[PDB]
Design a protein around this nucleic acid. Structure first.
Ligand SMILES: [Zn+2]
Length: 252
DNA sequence: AGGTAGACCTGGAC
DNA sequence: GTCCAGGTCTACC
């Protein structure tokens, strides 16, 4: 799930779990649990706590309990659902939080790439995975100034830059390729080669692109298809070790 | 010093 | 077999 989807999950999951108290935590794939390292400690510390809120930082959901925060990243396929403890579990359910009301928050992930970290609340923002997180892309803290400062300081591509969570929080691959196309900038361009005008323009498309989706694709996944703006076939290559799509005529 | 390219994970799809 | 994939996690200068 990408930032806008995580935001929808955050909004819709909260009312379904707020005020419930954890009676048990069952883990079927311990590797998902990254902190505490022992999945038995992770399970024991959460029992007895009540869910008080649910926030989002980048693509990370932050479950707020009485004493602890549970920080969860779903990666590509992770999913949460609330259902009855009386019903059989769906496939690929790796972690289940059982509440005292007979309902359960179930985490499913066919790829098992998702992660969970639990810490005393006041410690979460200063520990992994939230600690080096850059600013929300839709906040005033993510500014052209900030983006320029990071761009002129690295030898990496503009795409590698946008993909860096310390630069901006949770801006995924699809949004990076769509924003670069809307801004008219090739993804393989050295970040340091961008002009002020290009930076400002990239910043504005990033916000509109992800802003529109938080509330149809030009290039992502459209390779071999004609560009929606000019008809030239979209091209796909690998930049920053990821699938990268762009219009060769319109992006410079 | 620390910026940075590769590697790790995992299973379904080509 | 071979191929992705996010936010790490090494080594490597
Ligand atoms: Zn075009």
């Amino acid at each position: 799930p990408e930032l806008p989807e995580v935001e929808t999950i955050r909004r819709t999951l909260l009312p379904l779990i707020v005020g419930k108290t954890i009676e048990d935590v069952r883990i079927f794939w311990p590797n998902i649990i990254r902190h505490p390292r022992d999945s038995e400690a992770f399970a024991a510390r959460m029992i007895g706590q009540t869910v008080r809120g649910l926030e989002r930082r980048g693509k990370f959901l932050k479950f707020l309990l009485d004493r602890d925060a549970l920080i969860s990243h779903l990666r590509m396929e992770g999913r949460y659902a609330v259902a009855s403890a009386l019903e059989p579990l769906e496939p690929h359910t790796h972690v289940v939080f059982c509440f005292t009301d007979g309902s359960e928050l179930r985490y499913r992930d066919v790829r098992k790439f998702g992660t969970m970290h639990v810490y005393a609340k006041e410690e979460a923002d200063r520990r992994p995975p939230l600690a080096e997180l850059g600013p929300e892309p839709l906040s005033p803290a993510f500014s052209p100034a900030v983006l320029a400062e990071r761009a002129v300081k690295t030898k990496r591509s503009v795409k590698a830059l946008l993909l860096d969570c310390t630069v901006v929080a949770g801006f995924g691959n699809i949004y990076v390729d769509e924003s670069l196309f809307r801004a008219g900038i090739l993804p393989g361009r050295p970040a340091a080669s961008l002009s002020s005008k290009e930076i400002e323009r990239l910043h504005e498309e990033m916000v509109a692109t992800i802003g529109e989706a938080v509330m149809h694709l030009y290039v992502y996944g459209r390779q071999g298809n004609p560009c929606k703006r000019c008809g030239t076939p979209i091209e796909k290559t690998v930049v920053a070790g990821r699938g990268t799509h762009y219009c060769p005529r319109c992006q410079r």
